[PDB]
RNA sequence: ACCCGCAGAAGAAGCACCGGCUAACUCCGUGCCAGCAGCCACGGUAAUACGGAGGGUGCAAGCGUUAAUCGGAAUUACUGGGCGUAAAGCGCACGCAGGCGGUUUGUUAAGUCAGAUGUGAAAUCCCCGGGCUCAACCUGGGAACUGCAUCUGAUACUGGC
RNA sequence: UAGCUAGUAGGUGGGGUAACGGCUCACCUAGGCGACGAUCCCUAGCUGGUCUGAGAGGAUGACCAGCCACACUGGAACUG
């Protein structure tokens, strides 16, 4: 269900600051994100159009930590749903409980957030969920259990969140350790680097 | 293109024939080797190709390519048939799926070994 | 009101028995052309009054024979 | 400001007794991405030079086509040579569904959402020409009104 | 491991017979540069 | 014979019943004449669980329809609730 | 044989549009006249006039706005070889509304849009853009 | 079922591929040999194509494989092909069955369309929510079920008189 | 695969079926079916549906639902 091993290799292959680690240290100082993976790093071949779409898709998958079949399912769901297809796809991708948690600031990395979700720490609506792919509805209050309040990693994550970008569609509390889902995630709040159209085109 | 023409005799669809008639719409088939031999490929190439005339399950004497280098395959041995065609040899529409039944995997191959029935080593 | 159907006589050789054809307008599901489609039926007639090649009005009734299941109500055309 | 992209490159041979000259054909397409599209077809002995030529060609002889906000106005068929193309207006945010070459073509033009298919045989240059023809055919809701001498709203419904 | 003798039922000389069948063909190099040389698409293709 | 009987039309570990009017001898989960409602065996305290059309049931019995014991019990509890 | 008159008329119109003819003359019918009227209403043509007692001749005046033909594409969908009948909700929208379809509607021959508005279907004669 | 307590990453990752298609490339035997391959043929002493090693790519408790079926095939074209030269105009006429039918009026309502009734078992496919910790799943409502039939109409057309 | 068929097709009367009936017997008539493909042969569960497909369609019809058929092959009737 998840990739295991060298995780910054992925973003090196992409060539963009993908936030696949916590990032207290700079992304260029820790790894050569400018260069391609392996021997053929300094080499930069003229990339195909289909190829670029594929790469974008992979980047998106990397971002969330979602394997192919699940991604396909998500895409299908988006297609089923009414309105902007790419936007819909983005929405549920975010809507993944782990991703929501990451956005809030309870796991400093998305993989970390996923792990936290797995390890019985994330308690939505008064029920602790093992599953990361839980789609969160608007006006839902997710709480961190008193068993999980002992951890310093959570605190660190919160601090990181405070330092970084603040989401508008979510409200995070530091001392209370409570999150609030306000509205469905939109393209306006998220960065313009994502190319949902390309992915959509590919998935045909 | 006339609709009336279509009406009284409809579109005779192109009859989809199998590339592998002896397989009888089966993933694999078992056959005893009547002859095991090697013969030259097509004119763009120049080699010697591992092939076996096999007496089939359904009694269908067909020639089949043997994939991989170095084989334990001998005359009067039970083998399993992949339906993969080889354009190098005429009549050859079948691979032999290695590592199955009486036949064993190719020696010392490490990568792409799932096609040639070679086991996972400790390396 | 009960259902009524109209058609023309194919033959009236058989004693107290008529063969009538309904030229029904069928819409083809694949192409869309409207075909005049033959509906050849065995009908019971009284006194053998009709002639060959004659338009008659028939109604749905109980089976009379192996194929017969209609009785005529009125004759629409008589002239040959 | 101007979106510019290479679509296709061929190795095209002028055969002579002294030896076959291996020359490069280059097919590009430019556009601001708001309305105007212009294709360019430049051939040279070299490849970068050829591409430059193509770009230059694209620069002038540019087709001005109005767009329905960010999508196609009406289901238009663009035909050229053997390559016949049907092009359909697609719903909001569904993406450029067109091809490997045609997608790129439409990208420069500025259409975000399209449902397009080339039929029979499709040469890249030919297909681009067909597209262009389709675009030319394609007319705004006000142009049709003008043609009719009528109101746009009324025409719509 | 057999070779299917294109010749078949070999009666006199085996060597000579074999040398006169597909196994010992006249094999010609498809050289570049000169005569019988041109390739529309190379081994690795145009970039 | 004609019977008002419930059929286990649900998944493994997650059960679901549906109160139907059907022939007695025929398969339980196969075919039926008329369905009159449903029954949730989990029976959550928060939101309903049991739902039937009583009038139709009454009509059926007027014209002689047998009631299964469990079904009868359910009907009784519905009446009590009312 | 002179099988389809409406189709012939349409063809004539197309030819006129192509060759930049000011007036096109053709044999006339009541349904034909109605169609012409509908077209006029839609705004494609200047004016239509029928003249002839024994041999009625429909004259059609065409528009060429800004040096180009107004009636760009004009083609029958319903045909003598194959007739197409459409339901109320099944009625097409030719070129996303920017363009029309001639429909044989039971409450007078008219536009597809008009038919939709009414709540009535029928035979979809021609596609006009 | 699910929930409470304990230690420790402890016991749960690998196959397929990297010539172009088709995302990903270098070195060592090898040398039209061995082998590769879905196709265009790699291999002839520098293989980004064999085979291995290293570096990848993409999947993922899988992954290939052949098979089967549909698609892409607008390669049977109702939608949506054609036919001078590419395959494709009977060698040419007459001609019944059938198919197609000019215009005006009346007019049937056959056809068709409209509208209403009955209705199209369910489940699913589909829409809104609902219950599961979400998904797969069960299902509640609603929609659909393109129908088929009856009746009430419509007269613009198709056909019948 | 171009002709098919004498219980064959229809009548009248009888026998019977739970009931209509060539379902069956007597007798008369010479019919009826068919190029809108009868007939003969090859294959086949059919259907609700499932997959695919933009849609139309194309394939397919394990499971789940319904009908039919079959219980060693062939039959045959008794019971209810
Ligand atoms: Mg590549
Ligand atoms: Mg096709
Ligand atoms: Mg010819
Ligand atoms: Mg020729
Ligand atoms: Mg069978």
From Swiss-Prot, chain A:
CDD domains: S4. Keywords: Antibiotic resistance, Repressor, Ribonucleoprotein, Ribosomal protein, Ribosome biogenesis, RNA-binding, rRNA-binding, Transcription, Transcription antitermination, Transcription regulation, Transcription termination, Translation regulation. One of its GO terms (cellular component) is small ribosomal subunit. Gene3D superfamilies: Ribosomal Protein S4 Delta 41, Chain A, domain 1, RNA-binding S4 domain. GO terms for biological process: cytoplasmic translation; DNA-templated transcription termination; maintenance of translational fidelity; negative regulation of translational initiation; response to antibiotic; ribosomal small subunit assembly; ribosomal small subunit biogenesis; transcription antitermination. InterPro entries: Ribosomal_uS4, Ribosomal_uS4_bac-type, Ribosomal_uS4_CS, Ribosomal_uS4_N, S4_RNA-bd, S4_RNA-bd_sf. Residues 95-155 form the S4 RNA-binding domain. GO terms for molecular function: mRNA 5'-UTR binding; mRNA regulatory element binding translation repressor activity; rRNA binding; structural constituent of ribosome. Belongs to the universal ribosomal protein uS4 family. One of two assembly initiator proteins for the 30S subunit, it binds directly to 16S rRNA where it nucleates assembly of the body of the 30S subunit. This is Small ribosomal subunit protein uS4. It comes from Escherichia coli (strain K12).
UniProtKB/Swiss-Prot annotation, chain B:
With S4 and S5 plays an important role in translational accuracy. Interacts with and stabilizes bases of the 16S rRNA that are involved in tRNA selection in the A site and with the mRNA backbone. Located at the interface of the 30S and 50S subunits, it traverses the body of the 30S subunit contacting proteins on the other side and probably holding the rRNA structure together. The combined cluster of proteins S8, S12 and S17 appears to hold together the shoulder and platform of the 30S subunit. GO terms for cellular component: cytoplasm; cytosol; cytosolic small ribosomal subunit; ribosome. This is Small ribosomal subunit protein uS12. Keywords: Acetylation, Antibiotic resistance, Methylation, Ribonucleoprotein, Ribosomal protein, RNA-binding, rRNA-binding, tRNA-binding. It comes from Escherichia coli (strain K12). Belongs to the universal ribosomal protein uS12 family. At least 19 substitutions or deletions in 11 codons can promote streptomycin resistance, dependence or pseudodependence; all but one of the streptomycin resistant mutations (K42R) are associated with hyperaccurate translation and thus reduced translational efficiency. Pfam families: Ribosom_S12_S23. GO terms for molecular function: misfolded RNA binding; rRNA binding; structural constituent of ribosome; tRNA binding. PANTHER family: 30S RIBOSOMAL PROTEIN S12 FAMILY MEMBER (PTHR11652). PROSITE patterns: RIBOSOMAL_S12. The modification N6-acetyllysine is found at residue 107.
From Swiss-Prot, chain E:
GO terms for biological process: regulation of translation; rescue of stalled ribosome. Changing residue 17 to C: No change in ribosome rescue activity. Changing residue 27 to C: About 50% ribosome rescue activity, initial rate. Changing residue 19 to C: About 50% ribosome rescue activity, initial rate. Transmembrane segments: none annotated. GO terms for molecular function: ribosomal large subunit binding; rRNA binding; tRNA binding. Keywords: RNA-binding, rRNA-binding, Translation regulation, tRNA-binding. Changing residue 22 to A: 50% decrease in kcat for peptidyl-transferase by RF2. Disruption phenotype: Cells lacking this gene are viable, but those lacking both arfA and ssrA are non-viable. Residues 32-46 have a biased composition (Basic residues). The keyword rRNA-binding applies. It comes from the Bacteria. Rescues ribosomes stalled at the 3' end of non-stop mRNAs. This activity is crucial when the stalled ribosome cannot be rescued by the SsrA(tmRNA)-SmpB quality control system. Binds the 30S subunit, contacting 16S rRNA with the N-terminus near the decoding center and its C-terminus in the mRNA entry channel; contacts change in the presence of release factor 2 (RF2, also named PrfB). Requires RF2/PrfB to hydrolyze stalled peptidyl-tRNA on the ribosome; recruits and probably helps position RF2/PrfB correctly in the ribosomal A site so RF2's GGQ motif can hydrolyze the peptidyl-tRNA bond. Belongs to the alternative ribosome-rescue factor A family. Interacts with the 50S ribosomal subunit. Interacts with RF2/PrfB on the ribosome. Contacts ribosomal protein S12 (rpsL).
Swiss-Prot record, chain F:
Induction: Part of the rpsP-rimM-trmD-rplS operon. It comes from the Bacteria. The keyword Translocase does not apply. GO terms for biological process: cytoplasmic translation; ribosomal small subunit assembly. InterPro entries: Ribosomal_bS16, Ribosomal_bS16_CS, Ribosomal_bS16_dom_sf. Keywords: Endonuclease, Hydrolase, Nuclease, Ribonucleoprotein, Ribosomal protein. GO terms for molecular function: DNA endonuclease activity; four-way junction DNA binding; structural constituent of ribosome. Gene3D superfamilies: 3.30.1320.10. GO terms for cellular component: cytoplasm; cytosolic small ribosomal subunit; small ribosomal subunit. NCBIfam families: S16 (TIGR00002). Part of the 30S ribosomal subunit. This is Small ribosomal subunit protein bS16. It comes from Escherichia coli (strain K12). The lineage of its organism: Bacteria, Pseudomonadati, Pseudomonadota, Gammaproteobacteria, Enterobacterales.
């Amino acid at each position: 269900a998840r990739y295991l091993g060298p995780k910054l290799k992925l973003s090196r292959r992409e060539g963009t600051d993908l936030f696949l680690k916590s990032g207290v240290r700079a992304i260029d100082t820790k790894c050569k994100i400018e260069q391609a993976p392996g021997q053929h790093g300094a080499r930069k071949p003229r990339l195909s159009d289909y190829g670029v779409q594929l790469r974008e898709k992979q980047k998106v998958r990397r971002i969330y930590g979602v394997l192919e079949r699940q991604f396909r399912n998500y895409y299908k769901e988006a297609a089923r749903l009414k309105g902007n297809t790419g936007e819909n796809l983005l929405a549920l991708l975010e809507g993944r409980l782990d991703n929501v948690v990451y956005r809030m600031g309870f796991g400093a990395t998305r993989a970390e957030a996923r792990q936290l979700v797995s390890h019985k720490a994330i308690m939505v609506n008064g029920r602790v969920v093992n599953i990361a792919s839980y789609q969160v509805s608007p006006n839902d209050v997710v709480s961190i259990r008193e068993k999980a309040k002992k951890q310093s990693r959570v605190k660190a994550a919160l601090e990181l969140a405070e330092q970084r970008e603040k989401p508008t569609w979510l409200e995070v509390d530091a001392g209370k350790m409570e999150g609030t889902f306000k509205r469905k995630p939109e393209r306006s709040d998220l960065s313009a680097d994502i190319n949902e159209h390309l992915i959509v085109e590919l998935y045909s | 293109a006339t609709v009336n023409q279509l009406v009284r005799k409809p579109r005779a669809r192109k009859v989809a024939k199998s590339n592998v008639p002896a397989l009888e719409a089966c993933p694999q088939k078992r056959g005893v080797c009547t002859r095991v031999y090697t013969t030259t490929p097509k004119k763009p190439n120049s080699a010697l190709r591992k092939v076996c005339r096999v007496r089939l399950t359904n009694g269908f004497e067909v020639t089949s390519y043997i994939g991989g280098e170095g084989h334990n395959l001998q005359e009067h041995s039970v083998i399993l048939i992949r339906g993969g065609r080889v354009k190098d040899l005429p009549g050859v529409r079948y691979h032999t799926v290695r590592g199955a039944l009486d036949c064993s995997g190719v020696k010392d191959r490490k990568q792409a070994r799932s096609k040639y029935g070679v086991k996972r080593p400790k390396a | 009101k009960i259902r009524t159907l109209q058609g023309r006589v194919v033959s009236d050789k058989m004693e107290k028995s008529i063969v009538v054809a309904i030229e029904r307008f069928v819409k083809h599901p694949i192409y869309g052309k409207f075909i005049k489609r033959t509906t050849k039926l065995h009908v019971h007639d009284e006194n053998n009054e009709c002639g060959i090649g004659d338009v008659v009005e028939i109604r749905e009734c109980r089976p009379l024979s192996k194929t017969k299941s209609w009785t005529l109500v009125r004759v629409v055309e008589k002239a040959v | 400001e101007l979106q510019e992209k290479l679509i296709a490159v061929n190795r095209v041979s002028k055969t002579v007794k002294g030896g076959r000259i291996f020359s490069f054909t280059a097919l590009t397409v430019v556009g601001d991405g708001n309305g105007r599209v212009g294709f360019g077809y430049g051939k040279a002995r070299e490849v970068p030079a050829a591409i430059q030529k193509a770009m230059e060609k694209a620069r002038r002889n540019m087709i001005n086509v109005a767009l329905n906000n960010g999508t196609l106005q009406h289901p238009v068929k663009g035909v050229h040579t053997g390559s016949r193309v049907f092009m359909q207006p697609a719903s909001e945010g569904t993406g450029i569904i067109a091809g490997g070459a045609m997608r790129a073509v439409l990208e420069v033009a500025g259409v975000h959402n399209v449902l397009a298919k080339a039929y029979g045989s499709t040469n890249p240059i030919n297909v681009v020409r067909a597209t262009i023809d389709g675009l030319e055919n394609m007319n705004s809701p006000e142009m049709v009104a003008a043609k009719r001498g009528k109101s746009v709203e009324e025409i719509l419904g | 491991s057999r070779y299917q003798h294109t010749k078949g039922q070999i009666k006199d000389n085996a060597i000579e017979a074999l040398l006169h069948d597909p196994l010992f063909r006249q094999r010609v190099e498809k050289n570049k540069k000169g005569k019988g040389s041109y390739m529309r698409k190379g081994k690795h293709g145009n970039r | 014979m004609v019977t008002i009987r419930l059929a286990r039309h649900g998944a493994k570990k997650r059960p679901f019943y549906q109160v139907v009017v059907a022939d007695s001898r025929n398969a339980r989960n196969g075919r039926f004449i008329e369905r009159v409602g449903f029954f949730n065996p989990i029976a959550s305290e928060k939101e309903e669980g049991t739902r039937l059309d009583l009038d139709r049931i009454a009509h059926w019995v007027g014209q002689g329809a047998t009631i299964s014991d469990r079904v009868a019990a359910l009907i009784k509890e519905v009446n009590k609730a009312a | 044989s002179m099988q389809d008159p409406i189709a012939d008329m349409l063809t004539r119109i197309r030819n006129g549009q192509a060759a930049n003819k000011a007036a096109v003359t053709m044999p006339s019918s009541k349904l034909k006249v109605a169609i012409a009227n509908v077209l006029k209403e839609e705004g494609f043509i200047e004016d239509f006039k029928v003249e002839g007692d024994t041999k009625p001749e429909l004259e059609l005046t065409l528009k060429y706005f800004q040096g180009k033909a107004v009636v760009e594409s004009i083609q029958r969908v319903s045909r003598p070889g194959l007739r197409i009948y459409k339901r109320k909700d099944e009625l097409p929208k030719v070129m996303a509304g920017l363009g029309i379809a001639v429909v044989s509607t039971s409450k007078g021959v008219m536009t597809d849009r008009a038919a939709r508005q009414a709540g009535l279907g029928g035979e979809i004669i021609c596609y006009v853009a």
